[PDB]
Input
Amino acid sequence: LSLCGMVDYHKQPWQAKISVIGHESCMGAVVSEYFVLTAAHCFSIKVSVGGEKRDLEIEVVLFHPNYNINGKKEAGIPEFYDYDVALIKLKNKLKYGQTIRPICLPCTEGTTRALRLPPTTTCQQQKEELLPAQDIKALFVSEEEKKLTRKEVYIKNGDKKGSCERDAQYAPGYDKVKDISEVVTPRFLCTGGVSPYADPNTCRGDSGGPLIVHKRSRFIQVGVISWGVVDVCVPAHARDFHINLFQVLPWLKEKLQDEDLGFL
Ligand SMILES: Cc1cc(Br)c(NC2=NCCN2)c2ccccc12
Output
């Protein structure tokens, strides 16, 4: 079992850069020797790790079976980001080192050990530790002038969760949605806004990158960056929505079953 979430690419050795050819940009995270986790909506395909120039040979890209960006077009919702996760399977085994390391995923033995929790630890116990009912200090990784940079955000998972979710009404094409639960599903975590702190916002190029909790000197991926309310790249309603990886575990467990991650 790899030591996951342990340390520019020196400081974010899990980070992957994705280009799709006028170039669309996304990010992802190394989660095993053969897999990069990213957003489904990011999808000729160029993936790089370790700040390398080299583009890695792709075997297949696997998509969450419930993902359908067009799924609510008939209801007048232009883009529906539910289950916005994909796994890039690499042809060649990644060589872990100073520049290339896997991030921890929820409800794995890797995360149990990173959090110094006992062997009886459940998936629910990991969720209570990482995503308590409060404002949760987190980070994401962006690019500025070809250098990777950390940005600190707060996940609104307590008394501010409703306020964060309701700001979805300001996103492009969502202004006529009666029931915000139609676009903000139970798959989403919410960051951004000015309470409790003035959170920075994701850029479109940051989509697919990990939303990370930094705990006990370790980095645990809790989310995949999915969509924003405002393209800032700032109103108090500028929120960002992330796929909660605790909510896509059956799919992660099935696709990564042979990756020696020790899913619970
Ligand atoms: C950063 C960002 C801003 C805005 Br505005 C978007 N548009 C939009 N969000 C919900 C419906 N359409 C984005 C969409 C995807 C990814 C990032 C986005």
